[PDB]
Design a binder for this molecule. Structure first.
Ligand code: YM7
Ligand code: YM7
Length: 248
């Protein structure tokens, strides 16, 4: 029952059980909603929730000893393509799970993708998450949420938008970062030159130039401005690169 707070992780601290030496990440601090959503979650690519205690609120979450995805990405380089595909497969498994229970994360980015001791990816931090489907009825979102370089263009231009294509978009930005070690634009607006260049298909420029034609073809289907025309996850699962055997 007793835990030693060993060190700050980033507040979030590492706790180690006095008896078992099992480790847990303790988050100290909307929060009521974060707990409610966490209580719903159980999937191998989602950070585990062990429970909470009110004292200051404590959330007891999975300690992922492999660190954050951010740290497997070499600036301006990315990571080996087979590694990126594996992480991407795991990301999709996690997102499919969340969307299946009607939850959208709304802030997918490498800082929120942690790695366990076997480098299995875990989606982390449900502080911005919300319900988008309940009793089989979808509700459109309208709140501004996320992180600009990862946010889908419809959030900036539309009053309401579907939740699922927004998470799909951010996963595409994550994939870009894994494959090129750089983010494509400050934000997806017409005022953003890099974004305009993408819309005009200038893929001879960075970061696209660094990306092989197969994963780039997938990115062409994900980073589509019209969310209604944007590829869905069941179709990502049928993508050629997605299903390409890769070996380091
Ligand atoms: N600090 C602190 C703290 C952490 N977990 C608490 N409750 C738990 C903890 C827990 N941990 C079990 C796993 C077992 C495998 N290794 C990581 C921990 N399972 C269920 N409830 C209570 N207080
Ligand atoms: N919300 C939330 C959350 C934060 N850290 C968790 N576990 C960690 C966290 C960690 N480093 C601190 C994180 C690193 C990513 N940005 C937020 C703080 N290292 C190992 N395991 C689990 N859930």
């Amino acid at each position: 029952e007793d835990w030693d707070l060993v060190q700050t992780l980033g507040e979030v601290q590492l706790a180690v059980n006095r008896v078992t030496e099992e480790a847990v990440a303790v988050k100290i601090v909307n929060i009521k909603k974060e707990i409610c959503i966490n209580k719903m979650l159980n999937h191998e690519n989602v950070v585990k929730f062990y429970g909470h205690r009110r004292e200051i609120q404590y959330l007891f979450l999975e300690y992922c000893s492999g660190g954050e995805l951010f740290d497997r990405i070499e600036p301006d380089i990315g990571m080996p393509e087979p590694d990126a595909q594996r992480f991407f497969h795991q990301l999709m498994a996690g997102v499919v799970y969340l969307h299946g229970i009607g939850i959208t994360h709304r802030d997918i980015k490498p800082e929120n993708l942690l790695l366990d001791e076997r480098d299995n990816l875990k989606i982390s931090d449900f502080g911005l998450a919300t319900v988008f489907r309940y009793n089989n009825r979808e509700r459109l979102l309208n709140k501004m949420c996320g992180t600009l370089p990862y946010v889908a263009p419809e959030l900036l231009k539309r009053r309401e938008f579907h939740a699922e294509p927004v998470d799909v978009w951010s996963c595409g930005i994550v994939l870009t970062a894994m494959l090129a070690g750089e983010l494509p634009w400050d934000q997806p607006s017409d005022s953003c030159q890099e974004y305009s260049d993408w819309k005009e298909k200038k893929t001879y420029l960075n970061p696209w130039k660094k990306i092989d034609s197969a994963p780039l073809a997938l990115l062409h289907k994900i980073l589509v401005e019209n969310p209604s025309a944007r590829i869905t996850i069941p179709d990502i699962k049928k993508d050629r690169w997605y299903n390409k055997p890769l070996k380091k």
